[PDB]
Symmetry: C3
Subunit: 295 residues, 3 copies
């Protein structure tokens, strides 16, 4: 049922480094054709650092692990009209023969299915603000707690509740480590105000943790949090307030906040988002190559 691209299939069969990539960043992070440009630049960074990129999406009901140029452009061109597909939506998107842009929870599922150990993303979903009134908590976190894969993120955006997100990850048995810092990063910016529960200082360090996790057959995964580079590192609070006073909820809520943050920052937040996923791709690829060498 799942279609693995020729390049990814070759790599997996030969034990070469593969880096999984998600597609909601393509459909919902930015408009066409900038979304396509970024996805291709991310894939190029993966290839230029010795790994094979496996962008995951669902197209016409077919889960695809590894996308061709045609599939990337086709996905990107549909823009925000593509179904944002969490793990729980996969079966429905398949059954309806639809297109789906897979989130972290869905991409985890497919990456694990075929034995990809490293999954590069921008930021992971989290515990939402005021969750003690709503219980709005991303399935990304639950999925990572029972999928043994390493997610390479730039931390968690302050749109979400970062302290509670860290607590929920801990409850779900997810190892969380910041890269070359004692501070947990906050996606757009390096400062979250939260201490990192653990630290790793090199791609080789990361690969050794992953290797141990694999060998032990633990069922919980890992969140690496790579602070956005210092050269690429009010709007959130105002966007949040506006969000409440205009009662934006459900599926509209998260796209509204990110868009508002981008508008209020005049493109600065999106630019940072682009910079961080590229940085995650660099470090993630180095981790994957180091891991492949270990194995």
């Amino acid at each position: 049922l799942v279609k693995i691209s020729p390049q990814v299939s070759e790599a997996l069969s030969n034990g070469r480094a593969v880096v999984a990539l998600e597609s909601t960043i393509i459909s919902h992070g930015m408009p066409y054709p900038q979304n396509l440009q970024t996805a291709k630049e991310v894939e190029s960074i993966v290839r230029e650092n010795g790994a094979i990129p496996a962008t995951i999406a669902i197209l016409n009901g077919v889960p695809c692990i590894g996308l061709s140029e045609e599939e990337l452009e086709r996905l990107a061109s549909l823009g925000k009209s593509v179904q944002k597909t969490a793990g729980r939506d996969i079966a429905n998107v398949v059954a309806t023969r639809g297109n789906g842009a897979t989130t972290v929870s869905a991409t985890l599922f497919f990456a694990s299915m075929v034995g990809i150990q490293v999954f590069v993303t921008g930021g992971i979903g989290g515990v939402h603000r005021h969750a003690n009134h709503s219980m709005d908590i991303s399935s990304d976190l639950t999925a990572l707690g029972r999928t043994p894969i390493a997610v390479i993120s730039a931390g968690v955006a302050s749109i979400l509740d970062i302290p509670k997100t860290l607590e929920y990850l801990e409850t779900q048995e997810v190892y969380v480590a910041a890269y070359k810092s004692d501070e947990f990063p906050a996606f757009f910016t390096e400062k979250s105000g939260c201490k990192a529960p653990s630290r790793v200082n090199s791609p080789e360090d990361c690969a050794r943790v992953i290797d141990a996790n694999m060998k032990l057959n633990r069922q919980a995964g890992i969140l690496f949090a790579i602070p956005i580079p210092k050269h690429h590192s009010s709007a959130t609070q105002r966007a949040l307030t506006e969000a409440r006073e205009q009662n934006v909820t459900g599926n509209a809520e998260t796209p509204f906040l990110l868009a508002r943050v981008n508008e209020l920052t005049g493109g600065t937040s999106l630019a940072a988002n682009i910079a961080l996923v590229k940085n995650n791709a660099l470090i993630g690829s180095q981790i994957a190559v180091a891991l492949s060498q270990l194995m």
Copy 2:
């Protein structure tokens, strides 16, 4: 081989024919005698009339049974609340003590999945309770469905519970939730919850195709289909909702907690509504049995 599968259920499973799992806590605990027995038998009949084989699940003298005889349904109904209300976490204890257990959604999920039944019909699923922010009272039904790949066919979640938070928790647990032929998530006794359904399916065949995909993908999380109570009962919803609110207030003012709480609320609502809520409960489980059996048959045809 701790579990006993009846000849009728084993015959169906071995031949890839449609089977619908049914729970037994609605019999011993969820409904009074003898409507509890009457309804259980009528549900099994509806399952058969639509081409599937009913598999009511319970534990009898420490033996997990998948497929029950009429005398066993009668025993569960007659012994009533003296039968252990058996959640998944109670199964081992009821087996060890050689007791009788009427299985809830979390326990019935476990046994149905164990023997390869894909469709499980119930009235409603447990949920996040009201004031869960102070209590953290959240049904194991939700956790169980998040890690058991089976389709539960319900009429949604009762307003006794916190429906918006229940929907959030299901999402966090990776459970696909879809309302049947509606954009509104149903609230058990009534179709009106005030909550948008996160997804929608419009036919038994639609449902079967989602289940089929879930199976082929080997996902470990399950599915909640939520079937709004038939329109013929819509006039009763405001009444049952009003009584629900009064019963909740009464439970609080009388400090009814623990194992007493849920039975108190169901009984009180039926008393306040003069039997209307039980009548609605009977109608919705019959409707769920109808649609659930059609889903199971469609799925069997797909495979």
Copy 3:
């Protein structure tokens, strides 16, 4: 190998003799040197005296150890609180960095399950913290027990934590919870929690039959047995001190890694050693009943 199994534990596993897992955070962090070592030896002796083999679990120089020698116990105890408190999520990192780690319930569950040990004695399990409704601080011990089919033998949950919410969370995770010979769920240092136990078991054989059924059913969730501290082994004092310690931690914003050690230390200071003495008594009692459960289970099988 993935793990180093001690000669005594390996022999027991191969010959079907009852084995009781033990954790090491109680040694490195839960108790001071040398009371920690003294108690660990006494607990292991109690396990042996009732017909089982103790398997204290830790990570030493990056190697998971199942079963410890006298030398290794001395090592964990003397290095004390400088050893990494190692939850399940920390195992891979402690292994990768070749470090020493004292394993909590969530980590010890993982290693016990790996080698097929069914009974794991601890003092108390982590829980839902007070004010979790603001913090969402909920121990991974609970999540782990909900998806690891092992019987944890505890003395309940300390009132430093939110006992009612801990019981609710365990229920949500499908963990069977039973108090031993009581209708009241125990509160670690003291037998009185003010919470009714959701279920009750009255003998080690009762417990073993529940475990046996859980095993035969292939359920993926575990069991918490809660053994009330012996009536002869101050409860009134430790509860009063607990309330005071909680207030102090709040007024001083003690958070993160500092919080739980602060509360346990403060309660012991405020009670003049009474709570540590109770902690020693309850882990010995858990070892007694837990080993009897493990032997009864081995006999059943």
